[PDB]
């Protein structure tokens, strides 16, 4: 069937934003998974996991009696598609049960993991997510084999569909870096926003940089990717080898004895793939990598065995039965045991990988502090293990359950607990009086309170106007924020809020974060109002002010908008045309395609263009709330053009006189060229749309001050 | 970005159940367009419609200076999408302002009707549709021309996103037939659900077969495109020759001078497209079709020239300036007027196709007729350009306005007034219990109702079980209906229903189409009770019965259900897998993928499957309404393999033992395979479930019974 998609495969695609409706989703409009989770029996759904760990099924025998160590691998995978540059994958939404990760490469066999835990979710049903289950189940895994965690937090609700993500543009699984669709360039230069070296591999090439069996080049690699999905030298050392202390990869025979990965398989391979002729195709003869390596003498029990192996033999390269390069110990003794067979014994062996932490020099001293100081390594590995499984969750109000950690974590951007009693209606409206009388422009108030706002992101619920981290470096100093701008800004409300708190009694005060976004509110009642409209917007306290020392500023500079087409904004020159831009920041935002429409139009009307720029600002009455942006653009009386100066950027002129009305954007012009986006356009400027339009906008501008308001949920 | 799409090109599409959704609309959820329809001035809107015919834009010029032609020819366009076999396309979605429609070559220049209309549209706004607006339009045009219409209804909402219907495989606009996707084989048979001979095209290929230009070959596809789009001959001719009395075809020089279609154009264009090099690129030097033809000596004015052209000429064929064939009058002086130069006329011209008028032996009979009775074609033409543009508006309950006509027609498949007081609560409670002592089963109750109402399709609001047409020709006869249990069964329910009506006072009486739905309830009700559940079905009377001579047995052969995986029924053997016809199916009776879930799980238990086959059966307890059909399904003690004797039939087997537990066909093993649909069939298979999908199951049921009823909305 040809699709729009075959005749136009350069159209940008709204669909992204129409996912996750009340259509796909199975449970009724009111299912409140936190409430579900917390009347579970947590303790009796991990005394059923830890059971299920030496239970072994025929269909898939657990290697060494135990199936801990696949799950740790699973586990693992489901966080480890995580990118800190859009904070994309990762374990939050239990995505690696749809395509395309149910059958990615590096996800083989992790059909037979999840498939073992079905009776296990069968049993408790809606109370625990798959999401959670898998994340739970690696950590039962870790506990039942002498493993101490940090904790476990409940709360990451399930999805129904596949998540859009752009994993990379190769059309072939696992391609050689340098072909036609290369995600390389420069010196080995990884294209953001992408975290992983191949396509459908988690973060690198088990065999070295495009199969090169280099340990250190291989280790410029992990360096790279592990930064990129937020993880350091100490973190990224204890968790590989804190994995590897563990069960064992799977290589018995040749690759081309495997078939097709689930999404290909047949209707009878109901959900599960990569059937293997080899032999029996499963336990002793299993093939997922094609590695043959089984890194410690106890593979089902937490030991110190992986560094001693790595520093106490030296390392022969060698070859796998399916043909992979791994690496054997000169000289050594059978001391490793057979999965299956118990009168076998088998020399120690290692990945190119593992060798990277004895052969890079700053992972060299990391690694023999770990093996001279086991418990400095299992403190590490239990907290990088926290870490990698809770990263994309948000902030710590959304944490559910009875194993919550207690500690606060510098990469959870905490925020201070409120222990006072809050404003009420009538403060806040003094509060908006007194804004509005300092002599603060709507432009200045909206700009700053969207600035504060629209740094979250709803693929990993970081960001948003909670904490006033926009007065703080480094998002005081980011060039969309307008530096000089908004410090004048905040230095007014800072002297609004000192004042508003001293006069108070009983301990009510206001804290800055909170009224940054009320002035917002009431520049936009402002702008109402100066267009003849009398609006209330809604506005919920309750945020507090996190301090420059509870803020990591190197984790803080992926959330910089490097493309806001809300302020028209682009900081320089990119591949991607800033239309495509836009859908994904509206994405991000949790937008839909008329709510990305209506804020669009508004914010343009209202001055929050970057700089004061005119491009698209479609009004004589700036700072009024109207429709005018739709009225404008719509308009068949100019025509549009590109300057010579610059391709994206357009002028409009009176197409029967040739005068200069208006110039815009890519931004701005898609509107009223995307047969979609024209279509809501013309909604709102039609002559009876000024209500619907306010409202609209009024709507969606306090949908976007609280999407961080995890402790309003 | 690499998508799920190109890795698994062939794996089944759930997005098409999810279109549609409260996200992508502009308007909020309890908008209601037949309200804010109602209250249009329809009258000033015919005014200023009127008063846009002859104001001519320059970027757009009006031919004769009236674009009546021009929109004459939008409007049938919007409407000649339409295809009998499913009921998709056609105008009542508007469809032709998204992709790919409005991108469609035959659809050339229909962007500038569509601009022109955008001031009328912006001052009215959401109380006339674009859909409506477009035939309204055409309406206007005819009438300020001379012609008087049979009528008009309002009521087509508008949609927010592409209709997602498979217009073909091939790749290539216009590609010709015999290429690797050929809509064509065996003796020129066009492939079901087709109704067009090319992509991008609206019927036929105005130079012929092909570009062949034989109007006796061209009447041949004429004939059978026209029945596919549900108009016989007589309709056919008038409608063609109706036309073709107005306006003029655009071919003033070579093809190559037409840039991209709008889906393709820069952003510049502002949704405009096919922008012309040819000298001014508009008005006299047009190019939309490359024809260029004028039909008759006043193109702006109702005349019965048309015929008086076509049988006092004889005809040859020339070649328009863009190289295109088309038909000259032999001898004839120029008398046809110029569009822009009152100094020019031309010769008489025709199209390969409007002299399959004259050739083709039965259309030159209908022809005649009309061109030696004038006042015959008027209202044949009047009357096939109402059908032709209300053919998929459903039930005349759903018309709109001062202007429907009054006459009710054959082809909207009348349901009779109800005339008398409808059965209450406790005449309900009472006529179930007589339904359920006189023996019939569950299996019989629920397949019955199922037969009666799955019918529907909401693509042209055909289809059923309002009317009870289920007892009369052709749908008694239908196999997938199980004809010799359906009479027994529709005996027993006249039993019934003639002793209760026999019983009554005051005029009371219940009829049989209500009889048939309450009578499924009944079953639904009784299989919750055989399952230890106390549930209520709802039910809705005021259904009526139509009669066979209301009900055309020729437009109701394609409602005929040749698959139905909802009753694990396929006719014979199709080149698309029975797992997509199933989609397909739950998508025209618009079925989100949980309800088609929840669904065929339900009837599978229910005995719903023709000829009580047990393929997907997977209870021990059949006609009690279980969630055992999922539980089982999603049982790893079940290994699945393909039979020997047929492919498409599974038998599930233990597997430790080897022993036969179940047999399936695809349909029931895709909600085991498919990772969206097993995800959802894993919420109702669990253990905390039965209720839930008892109950969505009760809503499912009651839905599908009541999506004809908009008697009552
Ligand atoms: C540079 C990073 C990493 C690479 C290249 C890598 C590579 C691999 C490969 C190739 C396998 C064998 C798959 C199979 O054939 O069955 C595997 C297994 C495994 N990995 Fe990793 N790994 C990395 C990091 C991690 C991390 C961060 C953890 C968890 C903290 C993890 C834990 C495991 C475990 C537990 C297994 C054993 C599975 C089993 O017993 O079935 N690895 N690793
Ligand atoms: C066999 C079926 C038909 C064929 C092949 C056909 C073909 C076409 C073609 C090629 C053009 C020229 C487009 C352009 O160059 O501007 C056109 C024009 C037009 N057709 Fe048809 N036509 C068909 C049926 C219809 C029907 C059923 C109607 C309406 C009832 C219709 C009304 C018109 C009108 C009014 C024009 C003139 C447009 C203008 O003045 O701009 N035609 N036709
Ligand atoms: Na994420
Ligand atoms: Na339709």
Redesign the interface.
């Known amino acids: 069937?040809?699709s729009?998609?075959?005749?136009?495969p350069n159209?940008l695609d709204?669909?992204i934003?129409?996912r996750?409706?009340?259509?796909?989703?199975?449970?009724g409009k009111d299912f409140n998974y936190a409430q579900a989770f917390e009347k579970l029996d947590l303790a009796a759904v991990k005394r059923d996991l830890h059971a299920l760990m030496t239970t072994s099924?025929?269909?898939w025998p657990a290697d060494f009696g135990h199936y801990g160590g696949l799950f740790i691998r699973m586990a693992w995978h489901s966080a480890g598609t995580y990118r800190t540059a859009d904070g994309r994958g990762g374990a939050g939404e239990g995505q690696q049960?749809?395509?395309?990760l149910?059958?990615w490469p590096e996800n083989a066999n992790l059909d037979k993991a999840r498939?073992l835990l079905?009776?296990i979710?069968?049993?408790?049903?809606?109370?625990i997510s798959?999401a959670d289950l898998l994340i739970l189940t690696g950590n039962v895994a870790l506990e039942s084999m002498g493993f101490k965690t940090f904790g476990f937090a409940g709360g990451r609700a399930?999805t129904?569909?596949?998540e859009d993500v752009?994993?990379?543009?190769?059309?072939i699984w696992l391609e050689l870096s340098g072909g036609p669709n290369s995600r390389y360039s420069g010196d080995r230069q990884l294209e953001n926003p992408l975290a992983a070296v191949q396509?459908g591999l988690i973060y690198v090439n088990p065999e070295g940089p495009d199969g090169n069996p280099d340990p250190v080049a291989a280790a410029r690699d992990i360096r790279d990717t592990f930064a990129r999905m937020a993880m350091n030298d100490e973190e990224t050392v204890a968790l590989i080898a804190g994995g590897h202390t563990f069960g064992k990869t799977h290589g018995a025979g040749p690759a081309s004895n495997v078939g097709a990965e689930?999404?290909?398989a047949?209707?009878?391979?109901?959900?599960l793939g990569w059937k293997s002729a080899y032999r029996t195709g499963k336990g002793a003869d299993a093939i997922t990598s094609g590695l043959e390596v089984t890194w410690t003498t106890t593979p089902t029990q937490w030991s110190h065995n992986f560094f001693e192996n790595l520093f106490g033999y030296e390392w022969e390269l060698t070859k796998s039965p399916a043909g992979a390069h791994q690496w054997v110990a000169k000289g050594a003794d059978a001391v490793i045991p057979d999965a299956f067979d118990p009168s076998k014994k088998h020399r120690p062996t290692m990945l190119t990988t593992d060798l990277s932490l004895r052969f890079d020099p700053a992972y060299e001293k990391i690694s023999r502090r770990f093996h001279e100081n086991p418990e400095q390594f299992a403190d590490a590995f239990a907290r990088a293990w926290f870490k990698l499984t809770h990263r994309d969750m948000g902030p710590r109000a959304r944490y559910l359950g009875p194993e919550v950690p207690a500690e606060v974590l510098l990469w959870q951007d905490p925020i201070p607990a409120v222990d006072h009693p809050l404003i009420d209606a009538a403060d806040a409206a003094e509060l908006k009086a007194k804004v509005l009388a300092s002599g603060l422009t709507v432009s200045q108030l909206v700009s700053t309170a969207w600035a504060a706002a629209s740094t979250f992101r709803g693929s990993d619920k970081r960001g948003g106007a909670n904490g006033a981290r926009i007065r703080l470096a480094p998002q005081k100093d980011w060039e969309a924020n307008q530096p000089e701008q908004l410090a004048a800004v905040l230095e007014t409300l800072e002297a609004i809020r000192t004042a508003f708190n001293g006069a108070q009694r009983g301990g009510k005060q206001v804290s800055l974060a909170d009224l940054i976004v009320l002035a917002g509110c009431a520049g936009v009642e402002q702008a109402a109002k100066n267009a003849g409209h009398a609006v209330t917007v809604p506005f919920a306290p309750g945020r507090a002010d996190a301090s420059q020392e509870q803020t990591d500023v190197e984790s803080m500079a992926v959330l910089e908008p490097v493309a806001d087409g809300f302020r028209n904004y682009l900081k320089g020159k990119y591949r991607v045309p800033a239309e495509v831009l836009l859908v994904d920041k509206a994405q991000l935002l949790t937008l839909?395609?008329?709510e990305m429409?209506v804020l669009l139009g508004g914010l343009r009307v209202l001055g929050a263009n970057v700089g004061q720029s005119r491009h698209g600002v479609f009004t004589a009455r700036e700072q009024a709330l109207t429709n005018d942006f739709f009225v404008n653009l719509?308009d068949?009386g100019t025509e549009?053009?590109?300057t010579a100066a610059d391709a994206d950027v357009?002028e409009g002129r009176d197409?029967?006189t040739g005068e200069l009305k208006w110039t815009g954007t890519?931004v701005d012009?898609?509107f009223?060229?995307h047969?979609?986006l024209?279509?809501?356009a013309?909604?709102?400027?039609?002559?009876?749309?000024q209500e619907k339009f306010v409202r609209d906008f009024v709507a969606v501008w306090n949908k976007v001050m609280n999407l961080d308001r995890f402790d309003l949920a």
Chains 1, 2 share one sequence.
Do not use: C
Request: net charge positive; proline share 8%; no cysteine.
């Open positions: 069937g040809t729009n998609r075959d005749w136009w159209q709204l669909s934003l129409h996750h409706s009340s259509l796909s989703d199975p449970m099924q025929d269909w049960r749809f395509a395309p149910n059958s498939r079905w009776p979710k069968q049993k408790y049903g809606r109370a798959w399930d129904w569909e596949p752009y994993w990379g543009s190769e059309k396509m689930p999404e290909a047949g209707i009878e391979a109901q959900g839909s395609a008329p429409t719509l068949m549009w053009k590109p357009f197409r029967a890519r012009l898609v009223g060229s047969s979609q024209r279509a809501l013309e909604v709102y400027g039609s002559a009876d749309a």
